[PDB]
Write a protein that holds these residues in place. Structure first.
Motif, PDB file in Angstrom:
ATOM      1  N   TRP A 158      -8.919  22.924   0.444  1.00 21.61           N
ATOM      2  CA  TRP A 158      -7.764  23.252  -0.216  1.00 21.61           C
ATOM      3  C   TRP A 158      -6.999  24.504   0.808  1.00 21.61           C
ATOM      4  O   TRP A 158      -5.832  24.049   1.372  1.00 21.61           O
ATOM      5  CB  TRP A 158      -7.661  23.795  -1.523  1.00 21.61           C
TER       6      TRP A 158
ATOM      7  N   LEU B 161      -4.767  25.666  -6.648  1.00 21.87           N
ATOM      8  CA  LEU B 161      -6.224  25.924  -6.343  1.00 21.87           C
ATOM      9  C   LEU B 161      -6.998  25.924  -7.683  1.00 21.87           C
ATOM     10  O   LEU B 161      -8.104  25.400  -7.704  1.00 21.87           O
ATOM     11  CB  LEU B 161      -6.272  27.368  -5.526  1.00 21.87           C
TER      12      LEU B 161
ATOM     13  N   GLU C  28      -7.460  22.614  -8.969  1.00 23.07           N
ATOM     14  CA  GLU C  28      -8.330  21.679  -8.363  1.00 23.07           C
ATOM     15  C   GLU C  28      -9.838  22.096  -8.541  1.00 23.07           C
ATOM     16  O   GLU C  28     -10.541  21.277  -8.983  1.00 23.07           O
ATOM     17  CB  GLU C  28      -7.793  22.169  -6.804  1.00 23.07           C
TER      18      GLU C  28
END
Lengths: 67, 67, 67, 67, 67, 67, 67, 67, 67, 67, 67, 67, 67, 67
Positions: free
Chosen positions: B16, C5, C8
């Motif tokens: 990411w 983030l 995810e």
């Protein structure tokens, strides 16, 4: 994101210097960007690596090997 | 195996950060994992090597060259 | 966007728990996210629905039917 | 038919919120339309059902299940 | 641009020495060009890299790794 | 040109030692050739690089990286 | 970004008015957006130009010719 | 030719602003270039005309119509 | 054979001058080589004849017609 | 909608005058429609633009350029 | 017809200036031809229009718009 | 490079005279260029040789035979 | 219809003048036709537009833009 | 242009004499044309060169080599 504009301009200048046959100036550009801590250094590295030119690829490798 | 979950999470965070254009933070993540002796470092390295991205590949090479 | 983030990471943990055969822990993860009001709940739901696994699909349906 | 314009605008806003990842705001929009008795609620529902997105489909199902 | 002529001649001599089996003289030529600050060094490097010869490629890599 | 004969013999011995599983002896052969200043070192390196064997290739790279 | 939502809504209203046969109202909408300095004017122009309708194309040309 | 570098940078900035949705700033860039008498104005115009974007094409036409 | 190197360099310089558009300097180069009795004259002639350029071919013919 | 009938009749008369070779009368018809504020002007314009006739297309462009 | 020679020379100079990146000089050439009443202006215009270059085409349109 | 412009103009005039059936004037043009030492003589010769016309080819051969 | 004959003759003369390289005379012919109120002006315009010649097309556009 | 008729007649006579096997008369015809300064000499030369006959081609070469 003016940072993205600066990254684009740095990559354009780097590839132009490459086309004009000034590897020393490409190296100096990367040196200045690193000394400033400017993230455009990585855009320059990415452009060099994706240029497909052997001299640019070796320049990118050797410069990453020192930062 | 919570170790495998932590490896998955570390690789996800690394990729990411890669997509978000923060190679410095990828390097810091690898540094922290190495300093703590965490085996998730190798999952991060594997994800970088298999990402297919030139910057990630060079990061993985250069980091393995120092541990 | 650290929110992306976190989304995810939540989706990665949910799918990992699914692969490890812990539907109860997937449900508890969704419950915690809902209790916090965390938007990562929707990323978890999306990952479950697109996983292609029947248990995950039914879990997503049943949990949406209660929030 | 300004009612048709309002329906078009409501569906556009709903799909935009969907693309921006705000299911809560989609639900609030549907709730407001239902409270006002506005027929644009059905345009929103139709747009969600035909969007092809799983979250939108489940939202449409669950909202029809309560009005 | 007599600089381009000098670059062409340097690359021609380098590749000729390569064909004559004198890697030591190729290295000495590169060393002389580097000492003088002559930009023809990069023309020599480019010719070596694009020669398709393994010894020339390794010579180019190793020499770039020291300047 | 007995120098070419000596180069051929050195390359043959190097490849034979490679086939016999003695990388240490290949390295010692290259070391002796370098110490004596014998140009057959480059014939040995070329044979190793073109052998298509991973161990020989790595040996050639590592030895060129030190002379 | 509510600016993007406003751009989407302006383009939707413009194309709807176009489909309802009110070019005068499209022109008035563009005039209001220009008066307020709203960037949604350019989204309206883009939608008109990409509509593929001759009247919309001429409207876009003529309005750009005066701002 | 540093003039060619400046032309390249001006065209890169113009196209970047185009991608960022700032036609007003593209117009201001062209205005500044014209005021200073900088030949990079024509590089900007060429980039706009070859971008394949309707807004850029109309901007180029309208600006050439006034200088 | 440094004579072969000198022939290669003479042919390279001749073809470079040809590419730079200096037939007068090609003629002067051939004249100097002939005056010194240098056999590189024939390498230059061969390169001109095999260049495939009409001006070079005529230059080679005319110069052979006088030595 | 008698307005739609009037638009149809205006477009039919305009195209008939076009086939009869009376561009002056087409222009006068458009002028009358504009002066009266009649929306059939746009139906006439659309018919001219879609007629596929060069004179009609130029007439439509020039008339839109003045209203 | 020396007029035809002068037309040919004017068109050649115009296209050369175009290739050299001097649109201002193309415009000045057209202006001089118009001022002197020279019919080679139309040869220049024809060459620009048939060059297939966007800048030349726009130059030709804009100059015809003012004479 | 105004020298390149002069070369282009000389070649254009030479080919035009060729089309007009004036080999004598082509010869006189070449004579004047040679007398003045103008390098455009070679551009004229190249254009004649590449014209594909037998008379022009013979003119070029015969003129090169005398300078 | 002798007016149809006059239109045919006007279009023939206009296209002939076009083929003879007299755009100024084409413009003067159109000017006279307009001044006298002759409908053959439109036949001339149609012939110019359908000629397929760029100069004729621009002439027709520009003349329509002024009547 | 009676000059063109005279050129045609001279070329016809030259080719006829060629068919009659009188190269001496072809040469005398060329000599007379040259002596009188008649431009039909070049028409004769062109006809000879394009005749495809070896004797005519050599005649044309040899005669051009003396004027």
């Amino acid at each position: 994101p003016d940072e993205d504009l600066k990254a684009e301009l740095a990559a354009t200048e780097a590839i132009w210097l490459l086309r004009q046959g000034r590897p020393e100036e490409v190296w100096k550009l990367m040196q200045r960007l690193y000394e400033k801590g400017d993230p455009a250094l990585w855009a320059v590295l990415r452009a060099l690596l994706r240029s497909g030119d052997e001299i640019a690829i070796l320049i990118a490798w050797n410069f990453m090997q020192r930062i």
